[PDB]
Design a protein around this nucleic acid. Structure first.
Ligand SMILES: [Mg+2]
Lengths: 36, 229, 100, 213
RNA sequence: AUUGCUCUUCAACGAGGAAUUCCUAGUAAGCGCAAGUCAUCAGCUUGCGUUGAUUACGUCCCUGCCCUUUC
RNA sequence: GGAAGGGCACCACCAGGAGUGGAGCCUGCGGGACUCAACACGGGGAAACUCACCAGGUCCAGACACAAUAAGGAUUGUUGAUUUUGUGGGUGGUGGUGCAGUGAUGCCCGUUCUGGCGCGCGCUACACUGAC
């Protein structure tokens, strides 16, 4: 039968622009709490 | 004495899938697979590598051995019956997760890379090929019964059950039907995990058998019985 | 003659079984509407598949694509800072941390 | 009775795991592995493909867990690629995990013997032939060789005789490791076989042939 | 910088695990149109209109909550 | 506390339909055992235990025999036959370690720098009951 190798990551992480946006959301939330 | 067929060239036998139920096939269910993930990065829980963590979870680390499933998969996957495309594998995790294993897959031989594949599979719920054409490992909806062939015989491996001959058993069974084996990947436990689905439980020997050995011993019977070679 | 199952056009492999417009869309820089216009200028009936094309039809299509303006394709129709922002965000974060 | 190299009369199934890639490296000595030590073996100049003691662990696991071992009719010999030959007592229960298997092997290779209170694992002097039974047939696993039924093979052999099987644990290499001692090479299955499956493939037929059950 | 349009680029996704939430007639569900009228809301709130179902409408058996014995 | 008789409830039974959880977009709230005697057992980032580890740049690879060149000059960092050219040609050898300075000794087999997330909403798809 045919044989195909599985594709996977050595270490799984659940590009930087998304990381930048993620920090913005935390900064947006953290600041709003301080203002309140 | 007979003229040869139109085309003698050997062609790859069809890759069995859960959708197809008519074809006679071999089903092995590696029931009670001890596969669990936890963020430390997520890692497949192991009996030896992780001992303090599973103690915190409160789970007995004797029942924390995924390598037993790895060896059973390794010996089962590489069996010639799989090369003949007459065997398709299911895994029922201890948690209740049912995993469908496409026969085409080639799991890593080493355990460390095997653990990396389980954690990817459990979180992403599916595994894609390197060539990106099929999903080799996919989590599916319980129960197992719906996935199984419409006409099929169900048996478990029971040490206490009467000892039978695998080759004689498979011969006396009908052809259009299929056969399911529910193997206990647990190190030590009671053999009632598949009682609800199965109709009769069979013993492959008197002396105790390892999980991988029983899978290897059983499938040789089908290949001899079915002349898979 | 024989239907061309595959064809080579602008260094691209195009299937014969697909229509001309949706086969030519495969070429980079060629979409559905651009391929439609190229066909219409080339005076090729769109109902034909890519394999029925004669050599002259294909050559005319080539010169449509390579010389659009010469054939009156409309001009309107034809085709560090992030790190500084990150640093400013870090300064904002550390000052806000100092406040709390 | 537990079978041993000293006893030659009794019929038994000998399995020789030739081309075993077991080696200890100290930075403390640890068994070299394909995955654990990639950069170090790159420095050594050896390719990481042929640095896999996992295969031997798998073959030993299936062989020792095989029925015939429980019935006292099997003894295993391991020939390291470096030239070290290891005898395996049938009574042993090797670690099921590979990490503890690696720690056992490094202990064996340096201490030359494992004592827990008859050496469970003992390094012994080559050649293999002197240790093997006096009247015994030798075969190797060859894919190119004709496919033979393992069961039908065993019955047609005599009763006083024993059978030696030379299986290559090497990841990749020519099947000539045991050509010098063997008299004929046979094929077990029609499809390519891994070393573990071949050992599992072979032992089941002898259980059928000798009615070990 | 802002909001639109033209062309090109053309990804993941092939019905979704363990589990979980809601729902009985103009009801579920689909579709749009209008105003942002002191709180809330900005492809979000509210209102308006168009198409329009399956199943049940019975039971205390399981669960839960009550009523009566001015027993 | 018990018992009896009744009522009610898509936070109950029953029968189904919709979702959420898979993908894209948008968005609210919160931050110590041992199928495993021997080994492995309080560990967490490939590796790196105190001068290490990882990745790169220098230096080291002249045994000897013959022939030629060659003292009016082969080669050297100014020197003089040490090399150079061609043909043949052996060796793991400043090896280590265990035994009884010594031993036909058992066993195996380098140098200097440069860098290091959890809980929830909403919308759109996975087509032919469709798309244009
Ligand atoms: Mg009602």
């Amino acid at each position: 039968i045919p044989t195909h190798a599985p594709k996977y990551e050595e270490n799984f992480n659940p590009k930087m622009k998304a990381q930048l946006k993620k920090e913005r959301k935390f900064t947006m939330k953290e600041i709003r709490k301080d203002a309140k | 004495q007979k003229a040869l067929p139109a085309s003698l060239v050997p062609q790859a036998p069809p890759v069995l899938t859960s959708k197809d139920k008519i074809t006679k096939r071999m089903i092995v269910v590696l029931a009670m697979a001890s596969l669990e993930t936890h963020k430390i990065k997520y890692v497949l829980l192991n009996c030896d590598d992780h001992q303090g963590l599973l103690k915190k979870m409160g789970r007995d680390i004797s029942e924390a051995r995924p390598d037993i499933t790895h060896q059973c998969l390794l010996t089962l996957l590489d069996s010639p019956i799989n090369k003949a495309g007459k065997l398709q594998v299911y895994i029922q995790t201890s948690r209740g997760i049912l995993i469908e294993v496409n026969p085409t897959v080639r799991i890593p031989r080493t355990f460390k890379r095997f653990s990396g594949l389980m954690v990817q599979l459990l979180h992403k719920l599916s595994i894609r090929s390197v060539n990106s054409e099929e999903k080799l490992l996919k989590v599916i909806k319980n129960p197992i019964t719906d996935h199984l062939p419409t006409k099929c015989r169900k048996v478990t491996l029971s040490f206490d059950a009467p000892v039978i001959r695998v080759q004689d058993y498979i011969e006396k069974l009908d052809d259009d039907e299929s056969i399911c084996v529910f193997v206990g990947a647990m190190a030590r436990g009671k053999d009632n995990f598949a009682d609800e689905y199965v109709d009769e439980k069979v013993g492959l020997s008197n002396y105790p058998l390892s999980a991988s050995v029983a899978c290897s011993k059983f499938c040789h019977g089908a290949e001899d019985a079915w002349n898979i070679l | 003659g024989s239907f061309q199952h595959i064809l080579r056009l602008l260094n691209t492999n195009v299937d014969g079984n697909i229509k001309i417009v949706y086969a030519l869309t495969t070429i980079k820089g060629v979409g559905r509407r651009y391929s439609n216009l190229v066909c219409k200028k080339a005076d090729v009936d769109l109902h034909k598949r890519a394999g029925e094309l004669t050599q002259e039809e294909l050559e005319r299509i080539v010169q449509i694509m390579q010389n659009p303006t010469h054939y009156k394709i409309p001009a309107w129709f034809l085709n560090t800072l992030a790190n500084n922002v990150e640093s400013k965000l870090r300064d904002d974060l550390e000052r806000l941390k100092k406040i709390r």
